[PDB]
Amino acid sequence: KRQWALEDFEIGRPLGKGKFGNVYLAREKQSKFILALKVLFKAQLEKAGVEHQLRREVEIQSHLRHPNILRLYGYFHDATRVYLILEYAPRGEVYKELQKLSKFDEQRTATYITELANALSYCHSKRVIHRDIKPENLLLGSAGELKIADFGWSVHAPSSRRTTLCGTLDYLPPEMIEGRMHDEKVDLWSLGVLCYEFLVGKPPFEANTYQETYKRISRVEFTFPDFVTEGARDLISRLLKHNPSQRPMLREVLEHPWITANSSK
Numbered sequence: 001k002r003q004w005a006l007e008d009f010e011i012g013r014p015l016g017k018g019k020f021g022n023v024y025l026a027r028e029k030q031s032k033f034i035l036a037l038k039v040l041f042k043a044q045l046e047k048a049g050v051e052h053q054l055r056r057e058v059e060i061q062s063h064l065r066h067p068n069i070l071r072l073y074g075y076f077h078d079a080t081r082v083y084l085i086l087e088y089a090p091r092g093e094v095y096k097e098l099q100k101l102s103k104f105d106e107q108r109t110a111t112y113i114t115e116l117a118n119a120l121s122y123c124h125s126k127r128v129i130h131r132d133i134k135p136e137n138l139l140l141g142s143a144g145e146l147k148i149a150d151f152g153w154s155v156h157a158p159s160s161r162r163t164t165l166c167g168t169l170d171y172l173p174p175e176m177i178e179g180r181m182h183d184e185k186v187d188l189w190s191l192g193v194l195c196y197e198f199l200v201g202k203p204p205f206e207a208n209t210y211q212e213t214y215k216r217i218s219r220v221e222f223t224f225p226d227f228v229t230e231g232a233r234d235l236i237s238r239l240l241k242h243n244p245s246q247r248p249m250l251r252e253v254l255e256h257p258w259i260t261a262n263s264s265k
């Protein structure tokens with residue numbers, strides 16, 4: 001019922017630069033509740049033509065609540081900018097963790113996969129598919145649990161990381177690159193690419209050129225390093241099926257023996 005304004009927030013340190021503004025660590029003045037305030041410059045939004053996309057995602061995002069989806073508490077604007085009031089993830093970016101460690105062990109990875117499969121299953125129930133779950137779009141909450149970030153198009157790919165185009169291609173299902181129709185099964189594919197990247201430290205299809213990466217995805221050709229265990233190979237292999245129809249249901253990922261044995265939750 002209450003209406004938010006810039007004055008309601010104590011703006012602390014800048015967390016990073018988006019394409020249309022900055023994101024800041026902030027506190028709501030009364031409750032001192034910590035949150036992330038994302039700023040967007042309207043004229044810039046309009047010129048990039050993302051103005052209506054932003055509105056659609058805000059409407060959709062506003063109805064989503066899940067422990068592993070970064071929460072949109074609300075938003076407001078003045079004549080020049082729009083302000084997104086976002087959940088703050090106190091443990092920062094997964095992608096950085098991934099380079100600090102190079103790759104994640106089976107317990108960490110399987111627990112992450114559980115968290116995401118729950119999130120994606122919830123999304124599907126809300127008719128929301130093809131959520132971006134590549135590492136650069138994953139944050140960490142106060143309990144080390146994954147948080148799927150919102151509005152990934154408004155931020156630049158990490159410099160230290162894969163660039164935007166490469167990053168996105170790395171995670172595209174064969175059906176979407178072969179220009180066919182797609183459905184929820186797209187999320188099973190992303191989960192499989194992620195699981196692989198978490199365990200190995202690089203996505204399964206990445207090659208020197210976009211062209212080769214494209215080719216490899218289309219043919220679903222990749223190899224497991226020797227250190228990937230049989231249970232992980234089984235799950236990843238079931239996820240990275242060319243025919244979307246042969247991919248597991250999310251409940252089947254959640255009950256998969258490698259997940260059950262390795263997950264903390």
Ligand SMILES: O=C(O)c1ccc(Nc2ncc3c(n2)-c2ccc(Cl)cc2C(c2c(F)cccc2F)=NC3)cc1
Nearest residue numbers: 015016017018023036087088089092149150151152155
């Ligand atoms: O460095 C630290 O010490 C650090 C860094 C980050 C956090 N936590 C955090 N929590 C929420 C958000 C962000 N960061 C965040 C920060 C900056 C920017 Cl440019 C974008 C966002 C995002 C975001 C987004 F909008 C689209 C895609 C990906 C996103 F990550 N969403 C809110 C804590 C500590």
